[PDB]
Short mmCIF file of C-alpha atoms and ligand atoms in Angstrom, two decimals:
data_model
loop_
_atom_site.label_atom_id
_atom_site.label_comp_id
_atom_site.label_asym_id
_atom_site.label_seq_id
_atom_site.Cartn_x
_atom_site.Cartn_y
_atom_site.Cartn_z
CA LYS A 1 139.32 -14.81 -31.06
CA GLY A 2 141.20 -14.90 -34.71
CA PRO A 3 142.10 -12.36 -37.66
CA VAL A 4 140.07 -10.07 -39.89
CA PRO A 5 139.76 -9.55 -43.56
CA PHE A 6 140.97 -5.45 -44.55
CA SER A 7 137.51 -4.66 -45.15
CA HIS A 8 135.81 -4.99 -41.46
CA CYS A 9 137.87 -1.79 -40.91
CA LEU A 10 137.70 -0.58 -44.31
CA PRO A 11 134.40 -1.52 -46.07
CA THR A 12 134.39 -0.38 -49.56
CA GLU A 13 133.22 3.10 -49.26
CA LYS A 14 136.15 3.63 -46.45
CA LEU A 15 139.04 2.60 -48.73
CA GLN A 16 137.25 3.61 -51.67
CA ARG A 17 138.20 7.44 -49.78
CA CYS A 18 141.77 6.38 -48.28
CA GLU A 19 144.14 8.49 -49.24
CA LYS A 20 148.30 8.10 -48.20
CA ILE A 21 148.62 11.27 -46.79
CA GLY A 22 152.43 9.65 -44.77
CA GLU A 23 154.41 7.21 -43.88
CA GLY A 24 158.08 5.24 -42.41
CA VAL A 25 159.63 1.99 -42.25
CA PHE A 26 157.40 1.42 -40.63
CA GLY A 27 154.36 0.91 -43.18
CA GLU A 28 152.22 3.47 -44.77
CA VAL A 29 149.39 5.87 -43.10
CA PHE A 30 145.84 7.36 -45.47
CA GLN A 31 143.03 9.64 -44.05
CA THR A 32 139.63 8.29 -44.96
CA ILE A 33 136.34 9.60 -44.02
CA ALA A 34 133.59 7.96 -42.80
CA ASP A 35 130.70 9.06 -41.29
CA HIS A 36 131.73 13.12 -42.45
CA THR A 37 134.45 11.96 -40.17
CA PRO A 38 137.77 12.18 -41.57
CA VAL A 39 140.64 9.26 -39.82
CA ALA A 40 143.77 8.83 -39.91
CA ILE A 41 144.35 5.25 -40.82
CA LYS A 42 147.95 3.47 -39.63
CA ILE A 43 149.14 -0.35 -41.20
CA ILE A 44 152.02 -2.50 -39.70
CA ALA A 45 153.10 -5.70 -41.38
CA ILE A 46 153.55 -7.65 -38.70
CA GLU A 47 155.04 -11.26 -37.82
CA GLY A 48 156.10 -12.50 -41.56
CA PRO A 49 159.49 -12.89 -42.66
CA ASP A 50 159.65 -10.52 -45.24
CA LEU A 51 161.73 -7.87 -44.34
CA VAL A 52 160.14 -4.83 -45.44
CA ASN A 53 160.75 -0.80 -46.32
CA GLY A 54 164.93 -2.07 -45.64
CA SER A 55 163.87 -3.84 -42.29
CA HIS A 56 162.01 -7.52 -40.67
CA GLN A 57 158.79 -7.13 -39.20
CA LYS A 58 157.62 -6.40 -35.59
CA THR A 59 156.08 -9.06 -34.03
CA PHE A 60 153.22 -8.64 -32.78
CA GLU A 61 154.39 -7.96 -28.81
CA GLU A 62 157.12 -5.37 -30.19
CA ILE A 63 153.39 -3.72 -31.83
CA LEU A 64 151.30 -4.44 -28.42
CA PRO A 65 153.34 -2.04 -26.53
CA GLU A 66 152.79 1.49 -29.01
CA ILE A 67 148.71 -0.02 -28.79
CA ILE A 68 149.07 0.03 -25.59
CA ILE A 69 150.02 3.02 -25.06
CA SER A 70 148.18 4.86 -27.94
CA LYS A 71 145.34 3.57 -25.94
CA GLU A 72 146.47 5.58 -22.62
CA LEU A 73 147.28 8.48 -23.85
CA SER A 74 143.37 8.44 -26.36
CA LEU A 75 141.93 7.49 -22.65
CA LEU A 76 143.51 11.61 -21.08
CA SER A 77 140.19 13.15 -22.27
CA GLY A 78 137.15 11.57 -20.46
CA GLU A 79 139.65 11.06 -17.24
CA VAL A 80 139.39 13.40 -14.71
CA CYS A 81 142.06 14.13 -12.27
CA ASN A 82 144.61 14.51 -14.71
CA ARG A 83 142.38 14.51 -18.67
CA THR A 84 143.89 16.28 -21.37
CA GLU A 85 143.17 16.17 -25.28
CA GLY A 86 146.47 17.06 -26.56
CA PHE A 87 147.60 13.50 -27.41
CA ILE A 88 145.16 11.76 -30.05
CA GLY A 89 142.67 10.22 -30.27
CA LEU A 90 142.17 6.58 -31.01
CA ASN A 91 138.98 4.75 -31.91
CA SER A 92 140.30 1.19 -32.74
CA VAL A 93 143.02 -1.33 -33.39
CA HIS A 94 141.80 -4.80 -36.06
CA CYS A 95 144.22 -6.92 -36.15
CA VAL A 96 143.71 -7.53 -40.16
CA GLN A 97 144.56 -10.78 -43.08
CA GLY A 98 145.78 -10.96 -46.54
CA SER A 99 147.31 -9.33 -49.08
CA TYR A 100 147.42 -5.44 -49.47
CA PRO A 101 144.46 -3.48 -51.06
CA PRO A 102 144.77 -3.11 -54.49
CA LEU A 103 142.74 -0.31 -53.70
CA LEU A 104 145.06 1.39 -50.83
CA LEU A 105 147.61 0.63 -54.05
CA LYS A 106 146.10 3.13 -56.08
CA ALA A 107 146.16 5.38 -53.03
CA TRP A 108 150.41 4.31 -52.78
CA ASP A 109 150.74 5.10 -55.65
CA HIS A 110 149.39 8.56 -56.33
CA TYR A 111 151.58 9.46 -53.08
CA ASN A 112 154.78 8.45 -55.20
CA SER A 113 154.12 10.09 -58.31
CA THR A 114 153.38 13.45 -56.66
CA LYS A 115 155.56 13.79 -53.49
CA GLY A 116 157.86 10.42 -53.93
CA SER A 117 157.94 7.45 -51.67
CA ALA A 118 161.42 6.13 -50.02
CA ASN A 119 158.76 2.55 -48.99
CA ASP A 120 159.25 -0.72 -50.92
CA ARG A 121 155.14 -0.27 -53.08
CA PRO A 122 153.39 -2.95 -50.35
CA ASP A 123 152.41 -5.94 -53.65
CA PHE A 124 154.68 -8.77 -52.72
CA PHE A 125 152.51 -10.20 -49.00
CA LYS A 126 150.10 -12.96 -49.11
CA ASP A 127 147.11 -13.94 -48.35
CA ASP A 128 148.11 -14.75 -45.06
CA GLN A 129 149.90 -12.13 -43.74
CA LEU A 130 149.08 -10.22 -40.41
CA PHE A 131 148.76 -6.56 -39.81
CA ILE A 132 148.22 -4.24 -36.89
CA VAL A 133 145.96 -1.56 -37.68
CA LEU A 134 144.95 1.55 -36.30
CA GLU A 135 142.61 3.99 -36.50
CA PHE A 136 143.44 7.28 -35.07
CA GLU A 137 141.32 10.82 -34.63
CA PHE A 138 143.02 12.84 -38.18
CA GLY A 139 145.02 14.95 -35.94
CA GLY A 140 144.87 18.00 -39.21
CA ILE A 141 148.75 18.40 -39.75
CA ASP A 142 152.12 18.37 -38.66
CA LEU A 143 154.46 21.16 -37.40
CA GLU A 144 157.74 20.84 -39.88
CA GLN A 145 155.05 20.71 -42.87
CA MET A 146 153.31 24.36 -41.13
CA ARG A 147 157.26 25.80 -40.60
CA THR A 148 156.08 28.63 -43.21
CA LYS A 149 152.26 28.64 -42.07
CA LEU A 150 152.18 29.79 -39.01
CA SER A 151 150.36 33.79 -37.98
CA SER A 152 153.80 34.69 -35.45
CA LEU A 153 155.08 34.08 -31.80
CA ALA A 154 152.38 34.35 -30.50
CA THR A 155 151.14 30.81 -32.07
CA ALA A 156 153.96 29.86 -31.91
CA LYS A 157 153.59 30.18 -27.76
CA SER A 158 149.95 28.12 -27.32
CA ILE A 159 152.01 25.26 -29.36
CA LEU A 160 154.38 25.46 -26.47
CA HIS A 161 151.73 25.27 -23.92
CA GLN A 162 149.44 23.25 -25.94
CA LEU A 163 152.58 20.71 -25.72
CA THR A 164 153.98 21.04 -21.81
CA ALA A 165 151.15 20.84 -20.37
CA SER A 166 149.93 17.82 -22.17
CA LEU A 167 153.03 15.81 -21.29
CA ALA A 168 152.62 17.64 -17.63
CA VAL A 169 149.12 15.85 -17.70
CA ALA A 170 150.58 12.76 -18.86
CA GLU A 171 153.74 12.50 -16.33
CA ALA A 172 150.99 13.19 -13.36
CA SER A 173 148.85 10.50 -14.76
CA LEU A 174 151.13 7.77 -16.22
CA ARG A 175 155.06 8.23 -16.20
CA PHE A 176 155.03 9.17 -19.85
CA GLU A 177 157.33 9.90 -21.98
CA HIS A 178 157.88 10.59 -25.48
CA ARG A 179 161.27 10.47 -26.80
CA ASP A 180 160.81 11.58 -30.41
CA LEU A 181 159.09 14.54 -29.82
CA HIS A 182 160.18 15.56 -33.12
CA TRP A 183 157.71 18.64 -35.33
CA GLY A 184 156.91 15.61 -36.60
CA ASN A 185 155.30 14.07 -34.52
CA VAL A 186 153.45 17.57 -33.59
CA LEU A 187 149.78 18.11 -35.55
CA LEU A 188 147.78 21.33 -35.52
CA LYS A 189 144.03 21.72 -36.40
CA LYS A 190 141.97 24.42 -36.08
CA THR A 191 139.66 24.88 -34.31
CA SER A 192 136.92 27.97 -32.65
CA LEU A 193 137.95 27.37 -29.77
CA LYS A 194 138.78 30.58 -27.93
CA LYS A 195 140.42 28.33 -25.32
CA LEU A 196 141.67 24.71 -24.20
CA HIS A 197 141.16 22.60 -20.99
CA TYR A 198 142.69 21.04 -19.38
CA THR A 199 143.25 19.11 -15.37
CA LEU A 200 146.17 18.14 -13.89
CA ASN A 201 146.33 16.06 -10.24
CA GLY A 202 142.57 17.57 -10.27
CA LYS A 203 144.08 21.43 -10.46
CA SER A 204 141.73 23.02 -14.07
CA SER A 205 143.53 25.27 -16.06
CA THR A 206 142.60 27.61 -19.45
CA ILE A 207 145.44 27.81 -22.86
CA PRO A 208 144.24 30.50 -25.04
CA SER A 209 144.03 28.73 -28.85
CA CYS A 210 145.14 30.63 -31.45
CA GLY A 211 143.23 28.76 -33.51
CA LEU A 212 144.59 25.66 -33.12
CA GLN A 213 144.66 22.55 -31.10
CA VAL A 214 148.37 20.17 -30.66
CA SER A 215 147.54 16.72 -30.58
CA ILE A 216 151.22 14.55 -29.76
CA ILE A 217 151.35 11.46 -32.13
CA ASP A 218 153.41 8.78 -32.59
CA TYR A 219 154.22 6.81 -29.43
CA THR A 220 156.03 4.25 -31.09
CA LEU A 221 159.25 4.99 -28.63
CA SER A 222 157.94 5.84 -25.84
CA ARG A 223 157.23 4.50 -22.57
CA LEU A 224 154.64 4.99 -18.96
CA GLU A 225 153.95 2.68 -16.73
CA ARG A 226 150.50 1.86 -14.13
CA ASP A 227 150.98 -0.47 -11.45
CA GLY A 228 154.41 -0.43 -11.22
CA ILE A 229 153.55 -2.17 -14.59
CA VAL A 230 156.01 -0.61 -17.70
CA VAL A 231 155.57 -0.64 -21.37
CA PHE A 232 158.70 0.43 -23.24
CA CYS A 233 160.58 0.55 -26.40
CA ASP A 234 164.49 -0.76 -24.97
CA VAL A 235 167.13 1.09 -26.97
CA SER A 236 169.76 0.39 -24.92
CA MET A 237 171.54 -1.73 -28.78
CA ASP A 238 169.89 0.09 -31.18
CA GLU A 239 173.46 1.38 -33.11
CA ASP A 240 171.59 3.91 -35.50
CA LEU A 241 169.14 5.96 -33.73
CA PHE A 242 171.73 7.35 -31.22
CA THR A 243 174.71 8.82 -34.18
CA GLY A 244 172.62 10.89 -36.71
CA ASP A 245 173.60 15.10 -37.42
CA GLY A 246 173.06 17.63 -38.94
CA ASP A 247 169.58 18.64 -36.71
CA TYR A 248 169.06 18.75 -33.03
CA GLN A 249 166.50 16.28 -33.07
CA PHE A 250 169.36 14.01 -32.96
CA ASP A 251 171.15 15.50 -30.20
CA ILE A 252 167.87 14.49 -28.05
CA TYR A 253 168.67 11.08 -28.45
CA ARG A 254 171.69 10.94 -27.87
CA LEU A 255 170.77 13.42 -24.29
CA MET A 256 168.34 11.09 -23.50
CA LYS A 257 170.81 8.66 -24.03
CA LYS A 258 172.90 10.07 -21.24
CA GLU A 259 170.26 11.33 -18.80
CA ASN A 260 168.91 7.54 -18.77
CA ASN A 261 172.34 6.02 -18.49
CA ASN A 262 171.54 3.44 -21.16
CA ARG A 263 168.49 2.13 -19.56
CA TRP A 264 164.98 2.83 -21.21
CA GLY A 265 162.40 1.10 -18.64
CA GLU A 266 163.20 3.96 -16.06
CA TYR A 267 161.15 6.68 -15.52
CA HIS A 268 163.25 9.97 -17.09
CA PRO A 269 160.89 12.96 -17.38
CA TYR A 270 164.12 15.65 -18.49
CA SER A 271 163.30 13.50 -22.19
CA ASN A 272 160.31 15.49 -22.35
CA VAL A 273 161.86 18.62 -21.04
CA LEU A 274 164.62 17.20 -24.39
CA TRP A 275 162.00 17.35 -26.76
CA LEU A 276 160.72 20.66 -25.17
CA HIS A 277 163.99 22.82 -25.76
CA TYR A 278 163.65 20.72 -29.37
CA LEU A 279 160.69 21.97 -30.26
CA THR A 280 160.92 25.22 -28.37
CA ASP A 281 164.86 25.74 -30.62
CA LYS A 282 162.89 24.35 -34.22
CA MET A 283 160.09 27.84 -33.38
CA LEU A 284 162.94 30.18 -33.30
CA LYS A 285 165.31 28.84 -35.91
CA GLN A 286 163.59 27.07 -38.27
CA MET A 287 159.67 28.67 -38.46
CA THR A 288 158.80 31.20 -40.11
CA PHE A 289 156.14 33.71 -39.57
CA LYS A 290 153.66 35.04 -41.62
CA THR A 291 153.63 38.17 -39.74
CA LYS A 292 157.09 39.30 -37.41
CA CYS A 293 156.30 41.01 -33.80
CA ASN A 294 155.62 44.39 -33.94
CA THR A 295 154.10 45.73 -31.21
CA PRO A 296 155.35 45.56 -27.45
CA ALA A 297 152.65 43.37 -26.05
CA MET A 298 153.97 40.60 -29.31
CA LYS A 299 157.65 41.73 -29.04
CA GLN A 300 157.38 41.00 -25.73
CA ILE A 301 156.25 37.25 -26.37
CA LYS A 302 159.82 37.02 -28.95
CA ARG A 303 161.20 37.41 -25.45
CA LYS A 304 159.79 35.66 -23.45
CA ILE A 305 160.59 32.85 -25.76
CA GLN A 306 163.79 33.21 -25.82
CA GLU A 307 163.91 33.51 -22.38
CA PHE A 308 162.58 29.57 -22.33
CA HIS A 309 165.00 28.76 -24.48
CA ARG A 310 167.61 29.26 -22.81
CA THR A 311 166.21 28.23 -19.32
CA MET A 312 163.84 25.30 -19.87
CA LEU A 313 167.15 22.79 -19.15
CA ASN A 314 167.06 23.45 -15.60
CA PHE A 315 163.99 21.28 -15.55
CA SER A 316 162.98 18.68 -14.05
CA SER A 317 160.16 17.34 -16.08
CA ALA A 318 157.00 18.97 -18.12
CA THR A 319 155.09 19.23 -15.19
CA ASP A 320 157.87 21.14 -13.29
CA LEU A 321 157.74 23.86 -16.25
CA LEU A 322 154.30 24.14 -16.04
CA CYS A 323 153.57 24.77 -12.62
CA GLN A 324 157.41 27.04 -12.09
CA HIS A 325 157.90 28.76 -15.36
CA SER A 326 157.23 32.34 -16.55
CA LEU A 327 156.23 31.58 -19.46
CA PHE A 328 153.22 30.01 -17.75
CA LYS A 329 152.30 32.82 -15.91
C1 Q8W B 1 152.27 7.64 -37.52
C2 Q8W B 1 152.97 9.37 -37.75
N1 Q8W B 1 153.16 9.96 -39.59
C3 Q8W B 1 154.45 9.83 -39.83
C4 Q8W B 1 156.04 9.00 -39.49
N2 Q8W B 1 157.28 9.31 -39.54
C5 Q8W B 1 157.80 8.18 -39.03
C6 Q8W B 1 159.10 8.96 -38.91
O1 Q8W B 1 159.95 9.19 -39.81
C7 Q8W B 1 159.20 10.57 -39.84
C8 Q8W B 1 157.11 10.61 -40.36
C9 Q8W B 1 151.65 10.15 -40.20
C10 Q8W B 1 151.93 11.68 -40.00
N3 Q8W B 1 151.36 13.08 -40.39
C11 Q8W B 1 149.68 12.66 -39.86
C12 Q8W B 1 148.68 13.67 -40.50
C13 Q8W B 1 147.00 13.21 -39.41
N4 Q8W B 1 147.55 12.33 -38.82
N5 Q8W B 1 146.44 12.32 -37.65
C14 Q8W B 1 146.53 10.86 -36.07
C15 Q8W B 1 147.67 10.90 -37.18
C16 Q8W B 1 148.53 11.07 -38.33
N6 Q8W B 1 149.50 11.68 -38.28
C17 Q8W B 1 148.89 9.19 -35.69
C18 Q8W B 1 147.76 9.29 -34.98
C19 Q8W B 1 148.45 8.47 -34.20
C20 Q8W B 1 149.98 8.08 -34.76
C21 Q8W B 1 150.37 7.97 -35.93
C22 Q8W B 1 149.62 9.32 -36.38
O2 Q8W B 1 151.88 7.33 -36.27
NA1 NA B 2 144.24 15.49 -29.34
#
């Protein structure tokens, strides 16, 4: 019933181990460790009058959708009829009050020195400033940064199957659309499991992992519903979102607006198909693999992913793809 200080989320040792791993106009993303386990910390300023990274801060009302959707997708790992671990776990959410911790500014500076930042140094916040702090499971490294790091197109097959299954399960349970599943929002982490498990409308199956587990992240533009209450980001009056160029990613925003007639409250699971097509397109055109297809068996995998690319836009949802597409048989 009141905000907490930063130290409540980030006690001294946890704060000392923070390293910055990402950013956006929204704010900052740090990795840290507690109980021997990495976690990702996403920090968003809210409710204040300062521009931050050139944009106005969201209100608490405007941040609730991301919080709600993060929780619902996290909970899918523990459900029965519609179960998937292909989203990202949500450990906690806090409303914090205070100026930015100097130890986080230290991490911010290190990232700016080594990778470079597009953001303002977050050193201008007063002691009444509010933030949302989301703590997530650490999901690994994004697909874009793994452009040159994957073994083969067999790995790409696994990734696309994992993504399609997770989206299908969320469609079935929550009438979910991600709406921004660019390759920076697909994370990859090593697993020793040979196969991954999901359940779609009570029917369980498995996916060969190729040694990686996929997590879909970042629900800032996503949509879902429960008992007819729809949670979403109304981008109907956004200009900039629909005028990008130089990557198929930017066409997906326009294609979604075409599909939904600019009515973002509606359910159009074809948007998940569009994102999966964009990701397949990435796999075939921008990813480069350590081992190219040699064997009959691998060459068949390549042909099957090409087939997927040229046919998948004729499916109505991730659910339709998973259940009917030959790629997953
Ligand atoms: C922010 C994503 N960032 C990218 C921001 N984009 C903003 C738009 O422009 C491109 C960058 C960090 C990505 N890396 C990363 C790494 C490990 N992890 N492990 C978990 C996340 C997580 N995130 C994560 C979970 C939920 C939401 C989330 C991150 O939200
Ligand atoms: Na996951």
